[model samples]
Target: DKHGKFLVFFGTFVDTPKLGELRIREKTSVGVLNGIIRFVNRNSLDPVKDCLDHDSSLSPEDVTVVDINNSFYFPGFVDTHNHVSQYPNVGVFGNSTLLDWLEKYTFPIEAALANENIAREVYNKVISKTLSHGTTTVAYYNTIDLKSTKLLAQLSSLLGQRVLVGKVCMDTNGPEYYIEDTKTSFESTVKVVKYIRETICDPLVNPIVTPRFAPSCSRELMQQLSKLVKDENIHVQTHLSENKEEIQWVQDLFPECESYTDVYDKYGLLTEKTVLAHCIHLTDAEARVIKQRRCGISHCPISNSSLTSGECRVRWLLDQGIKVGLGTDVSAGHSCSILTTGRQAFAVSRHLAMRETDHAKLSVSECLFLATMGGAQVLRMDETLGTFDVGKQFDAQMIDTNAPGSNVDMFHWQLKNPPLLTNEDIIAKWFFNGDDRNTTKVWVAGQQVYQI
Candidate 1:
């Protein structure tokens, strides 16, 4: 409803358009027409005048202006990989890593979501929760149920969250009730893709191909799903080497293959549209192949740490020229906030820094980049979303340090002081101390999706 009319907002705009680079535009005015940012002007005195001047179809009353006070706007966070059906299990993984965790806390809850009432409740709750955390764009792996998967897509559009929903594809090795036959799995995925693309054809919500990792899916299922990528250009998301035992299991499952990456590569699943989660233990060959294919990695640092999985060499991956981004991977990841995930990514990199070079440690700006633009890149959406550029969607979050009871605090001297600690230091305070309370407003495609 907020995007019904052309709107103009005046404030301090902050964004990480590139890795390790923070761009700040002060006293800036941005005009959004039909959810696309049409103009970005700095040193603007009047936003209404500037917006009206840009397009002269009507008078003053036609434009709605928002004047921000003591706040700065940043591009909205993107969760490159997450499980919409497993949100109820957040913080419930309980001493289990990849394999056993799936048996105990993961599959049962995912299976229960097949019920319409329960599926609606879980899907709606997570959408509101993540929106509050400033996650404007998300990639979700939904349940195997076609109806439930469609419900997930519907909720995403209704709630105004940008999303890519995938119906889980597993024709083998899953729990008895959760597993699907090969034909059923393939047919259901076809149904979901068509349903989302043709029926609920909102541009904000798309359908992804999910294989539920190599262990859960059969070769036939994986091969069938991979065809969508080659023929239809559908996006793909699946787990890679996150733990030692899981890697061993993958190896044992496909001894004829050269490596775990080779199995997916054999099935034609590795491509630029693929999002490989938790490449924590990839071999050099695997990394090189992924780089060659231009596939993206979804680094779930918090989930990896919580599951006792090894830390991913993000710098190493970057050096190899592979695209990398951040993912919450909830509910294995305790918190849904990418800010929290970025904070954890900083700590995880520090842990890597102990044995590796100082370059292994990711800076605050770099982490924020991974949360926004880097995420868009991983999802292959950088051309249209992520940053505040002309012809880009105005997906953003308003951060108010002085919001009521916000975790961050500062002195009046620090507020106006410039010489002592640069803008970098003050934003560091927000990154470390801030939470959902600081994100007062969230927008996706210039639509006011959430406000508090």
Candidate 2:
């Protein structure tokens, strides 16, 4: 069956690594002949097609069909890190640095979880806004209240979006308004986890282990939660080394530890399933630790830049064999679009490319890969989502090329001279020119979540 607008091109298709380069050289052609695609090579006929045609013993008309027109297609975007509740707090308090910001704005705001109505209002707004910005998958940090946290999970599941929600577990160095005792924090988190496991039938929405950050979590609490790693196989999300002051704070909190990474490592939180947000202040040794553990890094450029948290040496981290993804970091980032995050990521990499002596430069493709495949790898969900391969969920976005002032025919032209544009240009223009008004539609699991 043909799925609207997308003509499913299926067969013994072999994707050559050279295909993209060939497309750039005008070496690819598309034409429908009796309900089948007959690609001709003007230069040299590739025998791969002949072999496939012969083995299948099928005529052109017998082949299945799907159709797409006037649009560039790619894998859906994945947001590796975000705080859904923090959506309401965007632009609330920007004067303080990371630590003070958390106490004055973040903590007090999150502390409002005692009111269910406020929680629901914030959660709904956050989830809807996230989908609108093309975040098909997210690793979310939820507040302490079990009921409100579950509500967030239910909202995601109802929307059919893939999300990993973590109940914030904190035991020390947080405002009394938001801080839960060690015992209460652990118990509340476990209850939330169990409820999600048993009640949320949707596999797209799962539970993760999140200990706010090193400074706010005690050694004993982190140690106890670390044991859940072996037993639960749950994903872990936490902050790391975003600001110099935060790094120094973590160091003073854990005098025995050498660096911020050491604190998480000591608690067994550094693993393949771990997704650490921000590593701006990480040392070479800390980088090695993350690489060795095979953990993922969620590079939040806009947030780091906005808070002056220090730009992460993303190229160096990627070179060290660490899987990296892009994150908006929301409120702190002040934008919901991962496409915008990609834009900031590309810009950050460009600046780093100019400054670093040994670092390799980043390309648009590399940055896009980080947002999709790299995000999936970080969350350990690459097997199920991230790309638009057949048999995978048909999660993708469609850019309205004919949108007002769009210059789709001049895809390359617009790259050089972008204007009022389409969803396709949202990413391209946003990355190149920092424009975000082009997104038109966002889809998840073949279902449209937001359309303009």
Candidate 3:
């Protein structure tokens, strides 16, 4: 319902529009018309008049002004990797790594989603929870069930989160209860893609081709999927070199290939639109090929640490000009908040710095950049989302440092004194301390979807 209203959000606009850079516009007015940002007026004395100044046709009565008290408008976080069906398993993995964790905690829960009621409950909660965490956009890997996968897409569209929903394809090396036939896998992939495009028809929710991983998919299946991907030009996502054991397993499974990354390339799955998650073990040549393919990497640092998987050399990937973004790899990654993921990304970098040097360390501004702009670049949606600029979509969150029950503690003296603490310092504190309690409001494509 808020979509029809011309929203003019008057606040302190903040964003890391580029890597290692922060753009903070105080006393700003951003006019959003039909989900797109129409005007951004800084140093605004009057917000409503600024709306009129942008479009003289818009009357004060037609404008809905959202004035911020102590909050700032930030571009919403984009989670480049997540498993919507695995949400129930968040914080459930008990000292189990990737492969064993899959058998014990993952497969059974994913198998249970065959029940539509169970799927609905999990999907609804996961979508709502992620939105509450200021994740306006997410790329989700759902169960292999075509019906349930389609349900995920429908729910995402209705619930108002930009998503890339995929029906996970696993034809080999999976439990009998969770496995799909190779032919069924390919057909189901086509069906879901068509269902999202021809049926659901929501621009906000699109389909991704998801080959579960190298060990689970047969060569024939991946070849067919690659053709489908090329013909339709769809987004692709899959796991790659997450754990040491998993890498060895992939090597054993595809001995014909030079490396784990080569398996996907041999099958023609390495496309510019592909998102490869958990690339903690990628070699120099593999990284070079990924850069050549222009693929995006989803750096799930929390999951890497929680599951005892190796840390992703994110700074190394960035130095090589490889695109990188944050992911709450849910189950394995205990938290769904991209902010928490970004913090973990920062922490993981410092951990890398212990072995390497300052070159491996990442800044708070850079982590925020990975959360917003980096994710947009990973998803190839940077042109439309990721910043508070005119001509971009107003997918944003309102961060209230002093909201009720908020964890971010700002001193009264700091607030009263003009320049005791810089806004940069405040932003850094929020980056480290803020949580869902501090996210007062959330919006996707200019529509006010969640409010505290």
Candidate 4:
């Protein structure tokens, strides 16, 4: 909580206020108290004095100012879908697709993390690495262990990343050593939810209900989880139609269901609170049901490309007015940086453009929106976390294009005299060539979480 100190950030602020609207507000002084943006003053001269002026009772010693020179503040990236527990297996998925990849590489590491020491190591790496990439709020899928998942929640809160941690719920169709029974999966989930909400008690970190996926979970467990959803109104996340073989497997597993999406809707799992990952090959009817339910989609383009998963029609989903966001999908997606995923998103859209038209491409501004506001909208945190607005939490990053030895190069002509003309071009270069090295500093809820 920074001991309740007030922070004033003065800088060139850039953000996408809406789909295609790029707002660049310069010389802005944003006052943050206890993590919330208390006031936004444009064309301000003094940030420190302004903070004290906003709160007369505040002493000058209690206020700290962060002045920007070559950097801009952007809304921190939100990862609506990621498997935090699978950090060790990143870049380890061979040529295997979804199901075989899980069996060969994923489940072993997830099962191994049951050891508290191993779990601690993985959780620490994920939080720090993601923050280094400027991911502030993440919807994390933890493995199915009471102790380890709790550790994940604790670590996330201590590290000050806005996170929703979920203990995977799988009642059957898993390795014998890794699977959970119906009763244990449901009951353990209840305990973890209580621990995260009541015991952890951190507003930034909360619990999410995760049903590993349709193929791995039993009907009894999914039905029971849907009841938990009704009683708790918690956030839910799972995969949907990521691969052809996986879709066929789901068909065989649930013969009565019309489609993979229906398999969840039939059990009352489709709701506004749900975040479905990898909706790559949804039928018109499946997309329609998603729209009716108001569920969010997490497009993992990198994972789809890495594992040979089908291309997700991101433009089609946006055209349908469905809320969509980006996801690293971690081990499957291959990196913790949402910027990398956004880059892949652009390429995936262009690939579709080769078949479809130029309308299928996602622009630089739109890709930025997916990394920030679209992700916030997917997680139902748009009002407080997406952009630099009054009454929103000060979750932001300092992008330094001139960071020492940065791959991105900027000419003096582009940086001065006419800054307005090159601001968007700079952002495009950062999106394409920038990595964690560009995110020099990160803050979540007005508290600095990472510095490079």
Q: In lDDT terms, which candidate is top? A: 3
> Tens digits of per-residue lDDT for model 4 on 1-452?
57488888898888887986777788999888888998888999988888887887988898888888567888899998999888898899878898899999889989999999999999999999999999999999989998999999999999999999999998888999899999999999999999999999999988999999998899999999999988998999999999999999999999999999999999888999899999998999999999999999999999999999989999999999999999999989889999999999999999999999999999988998999999988998889988999899989999998898788877676664455436777878888999889899999988899999
List TM-scores for all candidates, in order.
0.97, 0.82, 0.98, 0.97
lDDT assessment of candidate 1? 0.91
Off by over 4 Å in 1: 2-4, 417-419
User: Global lDDT of each model?
Assistant: 0.91, 0.71, 0.93, 0.91
| Greater-lDDT candidate between 2 and 3 | 3
Per-residue lDDT tens digits of candidate 3, residues 1-452?
A: 76667888887999987899999999888989889998888898988888888877888999998888357989999999999898988889888999999999899999999999999999999999999999999999998899999999999999989999999999998888899999999999999999999999998999999999999899999999999999999999999999999999999999999999999999999999999998999999999999999999999999999999998999999999999999999888989899999999999999999999999999999999999999999999999999998899889999998989888887777863265778888998889999999887898988878887
How far residue 451's Cα lies from its native spot in candidate 3, in Å, is: 1.5
Residue-wise lDDT of candidate 2 within 19-54, one digit each (tens)? 111111122222223223244222224333432453
> Sorted by lDDT, highest first, which candidate order results?
3, 4, 1, 2
Per-candidate total of colliding backbone pairs: 0, 5, 0, 0
TM-score comparison, 3 vs 4, better candidate:
3
Clashing pairs in 1: none
lDDT at residue 245 of model 4 (Cα atoms): 94
